[PDB]
Structure 1
Amino acid sequence: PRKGPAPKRPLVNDPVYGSQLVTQLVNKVLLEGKKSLAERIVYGALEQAREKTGTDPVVTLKRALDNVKPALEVRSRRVGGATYQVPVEVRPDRSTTLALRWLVNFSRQRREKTMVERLANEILDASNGLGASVKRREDTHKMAEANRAFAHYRW
């Protein structure tokens, strides 16, 4: 990253649901290098949500990502003997991928014994914004706008 920006690998469109969102989701929930396992897991969660709420899965996943959307990140920069928490605006792609990481981690945090329903439950409650992820995201905006005093460093 010293020379310049590095290229970004293009995303592969999904074969079944036809969205980069679901393949990004399975990639982030991917672990141990076993795409089949996580892939059938995300299929199970998708079909569970579809059969539970009886709605369109793609639109409710976009609704969930919009409800877990961050706005202004906080990053530490070193000056004057201390590290100050400067706020920085976030481009949409990083926000989306980190929010999806958040929702995957929080689905892993659910305690109903199997994630094939944990992730679906997280999807449906994020459609209502009732999970812990959305409240903690609200806390993130709380902190971001609470530390707005360091609006002059602009780091």
Structure 2
Amino acid sequence: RRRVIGQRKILPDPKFGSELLAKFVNILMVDGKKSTAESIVYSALETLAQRSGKSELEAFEVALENVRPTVEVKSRRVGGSTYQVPVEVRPVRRNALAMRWIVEAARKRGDKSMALRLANELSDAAENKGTAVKKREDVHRMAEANKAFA
């Protein structure tokens, strides 16, 4: 409201070393079972290996690049009407937005295990396809189509 904060970081990657990566393990983590999150966010790259090849490190971020937006809109009421003024999202929440929408679809795959339900979307990005990547450009639709605002 009238106060300001910084950020709530935590223990990074268990070994591959990657602070932000933790989010992918947290954001996805449910019922506070991080002990299992590491069992999914890690085993995931162990499967994309043969899938992609090059360091799973890049593999992630690689396709991830085709999932992170860069411009959204925020409802702002004025004189009764509430415009949808656009706004370019900084990297901080950008990368986050992706992970959210990414892990989501993965849990909507509706197949069997998540380990695979996760890799699919992790690669579906680069090759382009899936619900996750969908939102990416889907957001672009609302974007600019309202450029008449901001």
TM alignment of 1:74-89, pairs within 5 A:
74-89=73-88
**1:27 shift after superposition:** 0.6
Give secondary structure in 2 for the equivalent of 1:40.
helix
Q: CA deviation at 1:15?
A: 2.4
- 2:56 paired residue number: 57
Q: How high is the TM-score relative to the length of structure 1? A: 0.89
Q: Which residue of 1 aligns with 2:121?
A: 122
Count of aligned residue pairs for this structure pair: 150
Residue 149 of structure 2 corresponds to residue 150 of structure 1: yes
Q: Distance in 1 between matches of 2:114 and 2:29?
A: 13
Task: Give the distance between the partners of 2:47 and 2:138, measured in 1 at CA.
Answer: 30
Partner in structure 2 of residue 5 of structure 1: 4
Kindly indicate whether the alpha-carbon contact (under 8 Å) linking 1:61 and 1:127 is maintained by their aligned counterparts in 2: no
Structure 2: stretches of 5+ with no match in the other structure: none
Query: CA-atom RMSD, angstroms?
Result: 1.5
**Counterpart-to-counterpart distance in 2, 1:137 and 1:9:** 26
SS across alignment from 1:119: helix
The TM-score, its normalising length taken from structure 2, stands at 0.91
Provide the secondary structure at the position in 2 that maps to 1:109. coil
Residues 124, 133 of structure 2: 8 Å contact kept: no
Distance in 2 between residues matched to 1:75 and 1:100, nearest whole Å = 20
Bigger fraction of residues in helix: 1
